[PDB]
């Protein structure tokens, strides 16, 4: 077994953007390793899912994050 949890991405506490960084490259708030769900926004201006999620920047996002 090689689960390698440290290699999984963290999620921005403010905007939920996925990244390996301690702080969010988008909004610079702290990230957390405590998140669930995945929304990949490819085209924010055409995605009504992204509109409903309040996401206007393309990228991978957690559905929720806590810390």
């Amino acid at each position: 077994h090689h689960h390698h949890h440290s290699q999984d991405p963290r999620a921005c506490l403010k905007c939920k953007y996925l990244t390996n960084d301690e702080i969010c490259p988008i909004c610079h708030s702290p990230t957390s390793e405590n998140w669930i769900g995945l929304l990949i926004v490819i085209n924010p201006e055409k995605s009504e899912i992204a509109k409903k999620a309040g996401i206007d920047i393309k990228g991978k996002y957690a559905l929720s994050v806590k810390e």
């Binding site: 689960h3 949890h5 440290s6 995945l38 929304l39 990949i40 085209n43 992204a50 559905l63």
Partner: protein, 147 residues
């Protein structure tokens, strides 16, 4: 339009990633991909047409077809606010006791009981000289096991 695509269970996030890179590479009209832990074995793909999704998944391993019809935006809204973040506690994980007299005490998980939904904990506090057993829900993950 939004469609539900069947996938292997536990591979939803990975297929969503592969879908995302394929969509960008081939310039398909695919606008978002949603993998909810409330929809195990399913990935939701938002696209202009069904043909875009058919093209997207063609020859893709661990994918078994598109669900008939569409998924309306009303069914997706609740998925955007997930509930009950049920962590997966494992042997080797470092945890912290949430409530009670040992609130805030940290421990290594030495054993996990699925049948009873319990975990056995080697506490960092040497004052308690024995591993104690608690329900999973009385504990939160501090750090994941290393392998």
């Amino acid at each position: 339009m939004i469609f539900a695509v069947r996938t292997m269970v536990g591979q939803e996030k990975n297929i969503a990633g592969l879908m995302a890179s394929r969509a960008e590479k081939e310039q398909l009209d695919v606008y978002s991909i949603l993998a909810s832990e409330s929809l195990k074995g399913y990935v939701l793909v938002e696209a202009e047409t069904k043909g875009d999704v058919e093209e997207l998944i063609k020859g893709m391993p661990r994918v078994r077809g598109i669900v008939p019809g569409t998924i309306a935006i009303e069914e997706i809204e609740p998925l955007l606010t997930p509930k009950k973040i049920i962590e997966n506690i494992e042997k080797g994980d470092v945890v912290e006791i949430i409530a009670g007299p040992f609130k805030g005490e940290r421990a290594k998980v030495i054993r996990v009981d699925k049948h009873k939904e319990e975990v056995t904990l080697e506490l960092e506090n040497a004052a308690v000289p024995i591993p104690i057993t608690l329900p999973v829900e009385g504990v939160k993950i501090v750090s994941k096991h290393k392998d």
